[PDB]
Amino acid sequence: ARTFFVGGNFKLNGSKQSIKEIVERLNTASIPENVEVVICPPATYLDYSVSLVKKPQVTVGAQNAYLKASGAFTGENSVDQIKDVGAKYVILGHSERRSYFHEDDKFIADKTKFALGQGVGVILCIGETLEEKKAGKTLDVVERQLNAVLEEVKDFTNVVVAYEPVWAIGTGLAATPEDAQDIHASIRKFLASKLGDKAASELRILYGGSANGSNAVTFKDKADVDGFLVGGASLKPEFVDIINSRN
Amino acid sequence: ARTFFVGGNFKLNGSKQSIKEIVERLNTASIPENVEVVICPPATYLDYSVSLVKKPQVTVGAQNAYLKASGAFTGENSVDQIKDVGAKYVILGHSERRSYFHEDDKFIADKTKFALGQGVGVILCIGETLEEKKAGKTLDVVERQLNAVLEEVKDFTNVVVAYEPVWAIGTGLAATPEDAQDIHASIRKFLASKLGDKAASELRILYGGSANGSNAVTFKDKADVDGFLVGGASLKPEFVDIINSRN
């Protein structure tokens, strides 16, 4: 079956002291043996985070990387350097980068192929805005975003897809577990038409909307929801509750 | 007088092993007592670099940071993280980010004001392209870039300016020490009209064109060249020669 996957996107937050607390808590926490947890701290703390982890179920990932391993790209992160310090994943296509930093569909596709090629797992993010949602373009958007990646990537074995309901950010709107199940199902069905039912059935699709200790359990019976890409809750003790939400 | 300043921009290069070698060499190297050396490794190696440095003249800097200390900005570096791990500087406005990552004049200005406000030193980069050079817009460009920063920054005490002759990168053209002295003098005179002669006389203006162990010495008698923002050579043993180029 698809292994429950909980990613923790710290975003631009954390210090050596606060992250030490986050990791030590995970080191002593009682969590399922068959769960995959990936904490994603700022690049400045990747090495340190890896050094602190003493839990088999926990690995470390970066929040972004470039499409080349090295070169004259001042300010970027490299998947090879991420690997060098012991990290195992990289978040690509996060809505905050597609919007604020104008990373287009192909940029994300190019980064994904490169990361996978260097042996680094990818937490691929997709999602539509409120405007796109109201225009009834939800499927058109996620399909366009995925299609771009499919042009460069044929194997999603080392990939997990995170659906971000951008339309629910600061809009006074809220996505429900039913909303998640519906779109995850459509996404899985779409990817099956492009990669075949088998690959589609093995792909973890994570809910990337507001996920916390209080509401994680409300998604436990959604068949096509295989985990989460947690936001601010990943910096708190309740992150452990999310990991145990399907016990 | 102005203290000689040598920055080493590693760009997207390095491994824990290679950086250890670079830092250990600087630790045991014979360098001037009155020189400020700032090595700038990828964010992934900032903490490790600081931990290895044992030379008083050597400090560490990041290659880029956002204009906020924390928040929902997945993939960015924060000036507070720089301070947290003992780093002291941040490179802002490097040509590679202005071009490839579409960072405009105001974005750099905002980042600079924020970085300085947090007590982090800034290596402010400016420079014109081949087209701008050919159109004789060199001065118009550097002045435009600086003016944007001046709108937000009124004190350059904790700033060092790096002039990048982008027009000499992969174009078949080469800048000379005479070219550097001329533009540096013009930059200083311009800033003097805005910040006053005293502030301008204390400002370090670094040559950011191709600078290596072989040609560093050719800039020794140029009164307005106060140092370098070294590229590829900062990854090699000759970086030490650049640091000693004015003995």
Are A3 and A36 in contact by the 8 Å Cβ rule? The answer is yes
Q: What's the residue count for chain B? A: 247
Report the residue numbers after which chain B has a gap, meaning the C atom sits over 2.5 angstroms from the next written residue's N, or none: none
Helix B105-117 and helix B138-152: axis angle, to 10°?
40
Answer whether A66 touches B (CB < 8 Å): yes
**β-strand B159-163 against B204-207: which pairing, if any?**
parallel
Q: What angle do CA B214, B97, B182 make, to 5 degrees?
A: 45
Between the CA atoms of B15, B16, B18 and B24, what dihedral angle is there, to the nearest 10 degrees?
150
**DSSP collapsed to 3 states, B153-206:** CCCCCCEEEEECCHHHCCCCCCCCHHHHHHHHHHHHHHHHHHHCHHHHHHCEEE
B47/A102 CB distance under 8 A: no
Q: Is B35 helix (H, G, I), strand (E, B) or coil?
A: strand
Distance from CA of A198 to the nearest CA of B (A): 32
Question: To the nearest 5 percent, what fractions of chain A are helix, strand and coil?
Answer: 45, 15, 40
**Residue in B19, B44, B230 to test binding to A, most A beta-carbons within 10 Å:** B44
Question: Of B8, B5, B30, whose CA–CA distance to B19 is shortest?
Answer: B8
Query: Which residues make beta-bridge pairs with A67?
Result: none
Elucidation method: X-ray
> Chain A contacts of B47, Cβ < 8 Å?
16, 44-45, 47-48
What are the tokens at B139? Answer: 């001065």
> CA-CA distances (angstroms) from residue A41 to A57, A186, A236, B16, B208?
17, 31, 13, 19, 32
The angle at the Cα of B3, spanning B2 to B9, to the nearest 5 degrees, equals 120
Domain that holds residue A133: 1-247
Half-sphere exposure of B62 (CA within 13 A, CB side): 31
Count: domains in chain B: 1
Find chain A residues with C-beta within 8 A of B73's C-beta. 11-12, 96, 100
The residue to which tokens 């050094």 are assigned: A51
Please tell me which residue in A36, A94, A128, A184 is annotated as part of the active site: A94
Q: For residue B218, count other CB atoms closer than 10 A to its CB.
A: 14
Task: Give the one of B68, B72, B94 whose C-beta lies nearest to A74's C-beta.
Answer: B94
- Give DSSP secondary structure letters for B64-108: ---SSSSBS-TT---HHHHHHTT--EEEES-HHHHHTT---HHHH
Any A CB within 8 A of B80 CB? yes
Beta carbons of A119 and A83 less than 8 angstroms apart? yes
- For residue B91, give how far its alpha carbon lies from the nearest alpha carbon of chain A (Å): 8
Using CB atoms, pick whichever of B42, B64, B97 lies closest to residue A78: B42
Beta bridge partners, A38, equal A7, A59
B198 in contact with A, Cβ within 8 Å: no
Q: Which residues pair with A220 in a beta bridge?
A: none
Nearest CA in chain A to B78: A12
**Residue A190 burial (CB count, 10 A):** 16
- Whether B70 and chain A come into contact, CB under 8 Å, resolves to yes
- From B14, B46, B73, residue closest to A100, measured CB to CB: B73
Binding site membership of B: which residues? 9, 11
Q: Does A78 touch chain B (CB under 8 A)?
A: yes
Burial of A232 (0-12, 13-18, 19+ CB in 10 A): middle
CA–centroid distance for A128 within its chain: 16
Q: For B72, which of A47, A81, A96 is closest by C-beta distance?
A: A96
Q: Is A74 on the interface with B (CB under 8 A)?
A: yes
Residues of B in contact with A118 (CB under 8 A): none
Angle CA A206–A137–A8, to nearest 5: 20
CATH number of domain containing A56: 3.20.20.70
**Which chain A residue has the Cα nearest residue B19?**
A81
Scanning every residue of chain A, which has its alpha carbon at the shortest distance from the alpha carbon of B11? A74
Q: Decide the pairing of beta strands B159-163 and B58-62.
A: unpaired
Residues of B in contact with A8 (CB under 8 A): none
What whole-number distance in Å separates Cα of residue B91 and Cα of residue B239? 18
The residues of B annotated as belonging to the active site are 94, 164
Chain A touched by B15 (CB under 8 Å) = yes
Chain B residues within 8 A of A15 when measuring between CB atoms: 80-81, 84
Strand-pairing partners, residue A59, are A38
Does residue B75 belong to the interface with chain A, where contact is any CB pair within 8 Å?
yes
Query: What is the Cα B44 distance to its own chain's centre?
Result: 19
Q: Do A12 and B78 touch (CB under 8 A)?
A: yes
Cα–Cα distance for residue pair B77/B68, rounded to 1 Å:
9
Which residues from chain A sit within 8 angstroms of residue B42, using beta carbons? Answer: 43, 76-78, 81
Q: Are B37 and B58 in contact (CB under 8 A)?
A: yes
The closest alpha carbon to B90, from B124, B117, B56, belongs to B124
With contact defined as beta carbons under 8 Å apart, do B233 and B239 qualify?
yes
| Chains A & B: contacts with CB separation below 8 Å | 129
Which residues on neighbouring strands pair with residue B92, listed in sequence order?
Answer: B124
Phi, psi dihedral angles at B31 (to 5 degrees) = -125, 160
- Cα separation of A207 and A246, whole Å? 14
Token representation of residue A18: 């606060």
With beta carbons less than 8 A apart as the criterion, state whether B206 and B162 touch. Answer: yes
Whether the CB-CB separation of A233 and A9 falls below 8 Å is answered with no
Find the CB nearest B44 among A12, A46, A96.
Answer: A46
Question: Which residue from A45, A73, A82 is facing B11, i.e. has the nearest CB?
Answer: A73
Q: Which of B63, B113, B81 is nearest to B234 (CA)?
A: B63
B200 neighbors B157 (Cβ within 8 angstroms): no
Q: How far is CA A25 from CA A19, A30, A53, B208, in A?
A: 10, 10, 10, 46
By three-state DSSP, how is residue B230 classified?
Answer: strand
Largest interatomic CA distance in chain B: 48
Q: Are B33 and B233 in contact (CB under 8 A)?
A: no
CB contact under 8 A, B100 and A73: yes
A166's tokens: 């951008």
Which residues on B lie below 8 Å from A48 (Cβ)?
47
CB-CB contact of B242 with B210 (8 Å): no
